Design a binder for this molecule. Sequence first.
Ligand code: FAD
Ligand code: FAD
Ligand code: GSH
Ligand code: GSH
Lengths: 461, 461
Amino acid sequence: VASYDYLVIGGGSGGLASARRAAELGARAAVVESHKLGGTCVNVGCVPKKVMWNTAVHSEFMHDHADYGFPSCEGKFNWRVIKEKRDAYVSRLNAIYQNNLTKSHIEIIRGHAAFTSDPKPTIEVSGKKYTAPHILIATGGMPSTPHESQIPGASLGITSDGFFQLEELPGRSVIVGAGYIAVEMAGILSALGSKTSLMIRHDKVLRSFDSMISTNCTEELENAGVEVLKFSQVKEVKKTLSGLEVSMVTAVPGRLPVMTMIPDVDCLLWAIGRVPNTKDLSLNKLGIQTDDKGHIIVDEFQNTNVKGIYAVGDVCGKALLTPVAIAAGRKLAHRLFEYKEDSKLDYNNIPTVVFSHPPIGTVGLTEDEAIHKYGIENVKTYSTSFTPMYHAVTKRKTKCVMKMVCANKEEKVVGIHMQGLGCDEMLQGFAVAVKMGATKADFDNTVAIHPTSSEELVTLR
Amino acid sequence: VASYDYLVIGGGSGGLASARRAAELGARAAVVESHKLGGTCVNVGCVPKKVMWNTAVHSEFMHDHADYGFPSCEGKFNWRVIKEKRDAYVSRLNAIYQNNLTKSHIEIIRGHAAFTSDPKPTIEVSGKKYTAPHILIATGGMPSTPHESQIPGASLGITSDGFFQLEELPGRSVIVGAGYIAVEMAGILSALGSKTSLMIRHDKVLRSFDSMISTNCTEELENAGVEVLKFSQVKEVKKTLSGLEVSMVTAVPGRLPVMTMIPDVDCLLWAIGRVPNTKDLSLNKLGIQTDDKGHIIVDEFQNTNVKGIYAVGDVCGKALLTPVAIAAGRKLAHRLFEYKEDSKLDYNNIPTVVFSHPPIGTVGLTEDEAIHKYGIENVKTYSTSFTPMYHAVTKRKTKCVMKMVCANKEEKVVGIHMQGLGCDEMLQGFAVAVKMGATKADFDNTVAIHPTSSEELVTLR
Ligand SMILES: Cc1cc2nc3c(=O)[nH]c(=O)nc-3n(C[C@H](O)[C@H](O)[C@H](O)COP(=O)(O)OP(=O)(O)OC[C@H]3O[C@@H](n4cnc5c(N)ncnc54)[C@H](O)[C@@H]3O)c2cc1C
Ligand SMILES: Cc1cc2nc3c(=O)[nH]c(=O)nc-3n(C[C@H](O)[C@H](O)[C@H](O)COP(=O)(O)OP(=O)(O)OC[C@H]3O[C@@H](n4cnc5c(N)ncnc54)[C@H](O)[C@@H]3O)c2cc1C
Ligand SMILES: *SC[C@H](NC(=O)CC[C@H](N)C(=O)O)C(=O)NCC(=O)O
Ligand SMILES: *SC[C@H](NC(=O)CC[C@H](N)C(=O)O)C(=O)NCC(=O)O
């Protein structure tokens, strides 16, 4: 059994960041990876998605070309051109990440890891055994798909993974789901030219976001040409002579359910959830706790119920974001190797950007969460709605909505929510301010930058 | 003599903001304006400039169209189309601002104001006299032009004001100056298709900015096709049969001066400075102090040397920005009408964005200013340089440069400087953090937003 100071299972965002920071502190570390380094963020997540988003943003601006004094641009988008360039970029990143591991002297064990029934925590990769006093599970998650038992023909649809393998733009697509991944996919496919429908169980998307955002986002999707099919779900999917045919049931409250058929669908994309990657780890061999969804249970320091075993990232099921897995992975390295016992990630005030059109930026509490935590009498909100100056000369329009949630007498800023052009790069700094405990006066005392959209947040009254 | 509680001379950014906040506090106010309400910001400044910048940004993205999988866009830009739409937008704003004054019950006295030799401060507009216990001078400034005595034919060139009256795109243009206005004009004319040259007295533009920015900005201008004529100045300008001919002297240190002729110039734009608007106020009648440039001298509370007379905005010559005139105007209203004697604007940490290509964002101290204030041993800087992800698939490239200036042991963030895509909307929030006294650890403890450019500022090592 080869011994190390730190054994990391999973070469994605959390696993890499932790192994690297540990190595910097002197730990002899090894990372086990059964696929491609960079994990979801590089291969089928953040990076390829962002490239596709920039492409979709290009299509929208092309629509405004004539308004800006130029001749109109025709429009024929060529999917495989960008797909090939996107794949190439991802290839460059995998090479870079591998190089980063080698330069830090981190061993890479290629293959699938599973725990053994050995007393002291030990794993086995391809017949070989490895052990360490500290083992991190950072195996991430997968897209969830419906079972053929409940939805016949569900397997005819693809997930976000399959979206990244598409070689042609689907002519007609139906996305099922109301979370951010669903919204992003719908927004990209629609901007690029696919006749798109988004099927949600209720009446709005992103229902866990502040209500101002769920409402505004649902309206912008419709204004952009996405058909939002409300109170609907898939009953069955079948392969016809040309495409797929989706049978859905729409059940609006106060009306009778109606069954509809959606024919000639080229692409059915399930964006209903993520499942943790833990089934083949043999967690049960060591008695590591998991919830009923398969997530590994951890305390505030990322400890599992077994000493010397930790877990970070998507596998834990909380705050499923790349920067969160990274920060939790690094804080863990410092606790274990720099002996900083108070080193852990604060899961409050984690900022998020949803790459919709326009993009969404959020940090802190929604109005309801603040109301429930401080009480109505102690919660004051400020908001604004306006048309960005960029649209002063265009026929096409989008809006910018901003909301500030303040708590107590001092009006401590506990939440910022916004949607609009530029919101994707606007959030980071305000997130720093909110993490510091800024009050509305701190915002009000900062001189504005004119003309920008960002200045509206420091001039709210 | 009609009496008021507050008489404001000038209907621009500072004058309007102050009059409005005063009216909200109960003051009977009147604003004197000899031209168009909204002043420079609306008519020949921020607003028309931003529209032209968005247009120039459109031209740059059109260049990347084919790289993004679309068919190429031809290119013939039509200047008068956007000019007409821009003028219309400015018309809408003037109407809005006038409405805002009427709804606040602020009287608008149309005309040119001048002080009288009356003992108690009194002004006269078109034969009629007006007085108040508090009079604010917010007359702004003008573009500076060379004298025909020193530069013969200087009057053949235009200023930024004249730039906004152009009805056609000049085929060949020469901009003289190295400040932000010069850089902005050069960037817009060049992106729109004019063969552009920028004539500067030294070797870099924006010399008063952090050195990383002056250098980077000079390089980006050249990379974008602007001919930067270094160590050069205009000696004479003459009207030829077709355009203008500019005689310039280039005097590089360590070489002999060389005289050059620039022929067939369609547009010569002077962007050398701003002069205060104070000559026709008869300041001398009350003995109000001014410097040798004509700026009105004021203390930290915007008081002049005469009781009951104040001055804010460009006329004072410090921090010539729209938001500064506004904030100083409002703080003044609170001091005088809400009796908050400690109400005044803090001129430290004022953020600025220069709409170049890519845009520049700056707040706080440059590396040299920090070195001089804390001493080399106490100044630590962190910086990064990278190519935005947007260019991962394009042949055309721009860079993103960021620098953080920290002071003392705690590494207090005293300055942030950056240039790159998205930097125009990225600054506001970090400005709030810096105004609050954030340290590098405050930045480091905020979870990053991936993938964005803004996340680089919270992950500097
Ligand atoms: C479509 C999509 C878009 C997203 N967009 C964003 C975004 O814009 N911003 C953002 O912050 N987040 C985004 N996310 C979420 C983000 O990608 C994840 O939160 C992050 O990748 C989780 O990192 P991780 O380390 O927990 O897991 P992963 O990155 O998934 O890494 C797990 C790695 O472990 C490996 N592995 C699993 N089991 C084993 C085993 N037994 N032995 C060996 N190797 C194993 C896997 O191959 C994988 O490489 C997106 C996700 C998706 C799918
Ligand atoms: C090309 C250009 C681009 C700029 N871009 C930016 C930018 O992007 N961001 C930014 O923050 N700043 C920018 N500025 C600077 C900004 O416009 C000024 O700082 C701001 O307008 C100053 O406001 P003010 O109230 O001091 O003066 P002004 O806005 O000039 O207002 C003065 C007003 O007083 C009136 N007036 C003068 N004398 C009299 C008199 N005797 N009687 C009656 N009325 C009188 C004038 O007609 C004028 O309307 C730019 C400036 C220019 C020229
Ligand atoms: S897309 C893969 C992830 N990249 C990042 O999020 C960049 C991280 C920042 N540059 C940073 O915090 O340093 C990821 O897997 N990152 C791995 C890493 O160790 O940076
Ligand atoms: S372009 C004219 C100026 N407008 C602004 O800068 C907007 C100000 C902000 N919305 C704010 O601080 O409220 C200007 O002249 N503004 C006049 C005003 O009173 O807002």
